[PDB]
Design a protein around this ligand. Structure first.
Ligand code: UE7
Ligand code: ZN
Length: 257
């Protein structure tokens, strides 16, 4: 239905999802001269159990790496949160060339891709489906990915893609701790926002890392070689899946640093 093509993409999502033009939409451009340092922000604490890794899925516009979320084996705490948030997925966004592909920008600078590590509030809610539409329901860590040296931490993820080439394919994806993908510094920006694609719920507290991680030109190429079609149809590579930045509408981006 929705996608990233000219007909079904970001500038058209508002026709079926009017919250696309809301006051808490993501991503945003982080202007560093407008951020406010908040003394009350605690360090980010991630503690993930590799045994929670479950499955990798070609979802047509992207691929998702899902985690078992029946208990608190894998949690995010700290930062702006009083509640524990339970890991459920990570995924990436990328663009059609190295020049763009991140969702968030910093001082107008576009990176080549972005990693999202997503969690839901298990202190207040009983399931992702309950949490996903609540203002305090989701927490996503975003990592900007700067084109440069090959990142060996991506190897297991990239090696898995050949088994999920076309839409709907899925495979087991086990024994992996995604905190290995995060940068050395967890210094961060935070702001209240949204899912960056439909259904665009304004339910996400964003944690954007100040430090980038690397990716090579060829690693990006592997993401863009995934196919959005189902097996047996004409091949339609997944060339891009990044939303443009959206107006802050008077929100404050807080800095931990
Ligand atoms: C509500 C269903 N969302 C889901 O399964 N994964 C998801 C999709 C998008 C985002 S995002 N791009 O981090 O806003 C975070 C998580
Ligand atoms: Zn995302």
């Amino acid at each position: 239905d929705w996608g990233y093509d000219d007909k079904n993409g970001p500038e058209q999502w508002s026709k079926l999802y009017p919250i696309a033009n809301g006051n808490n939409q993501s991503p945003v451009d982080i202007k560093t001269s407008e951020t406010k340092h908040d003394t009350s922000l605690k360090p980010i604490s991630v503690s993930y159990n590799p045994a929670t890794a479950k499955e990798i899925i070609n979802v047509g516009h992207s691929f998702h790496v899902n985690f078992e979320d029946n208990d608190n084996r894998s949690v995010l705490k700290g930062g702006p949160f009083s509640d524990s948030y339970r890991l459920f997925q990570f995924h990436f966004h990328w663009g059609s060339t190295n020049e763009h592909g991140s969702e968030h920008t910093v001082d107008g600078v576009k990176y080549s891709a972005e990693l999202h590590v997503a969690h839901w509030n298990s202190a207040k809610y009983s399931s992702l489906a309950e949490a996903a539409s609540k203002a305090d329901g989701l927490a996503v860590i975003g990592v900007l990915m700067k084109v440069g040296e090959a990142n060996p931490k991506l190897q297991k993820v990239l090696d898995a893609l050949q088994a999920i080439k076309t839409k709907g394919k899925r495979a087991p994806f086990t024994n992996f701790d995604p905190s290995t993908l995060l940068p050395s510094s967890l210094d961060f920006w935070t702001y209240p926002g949204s899912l960056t694609h439909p259904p665009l719920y304004e339910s996400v507290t964003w944690i954007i890392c100040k430090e980038s991680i690397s990716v090579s030109s060829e690693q990006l190429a592997q993401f863009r070689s995934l196919l959005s079609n189902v097996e047996g149809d004409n091949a339609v590579p997944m060339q891009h899946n990044n939303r443009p930045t959206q107006p802050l509408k008077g929100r404050t981006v807080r800095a931990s640093f």
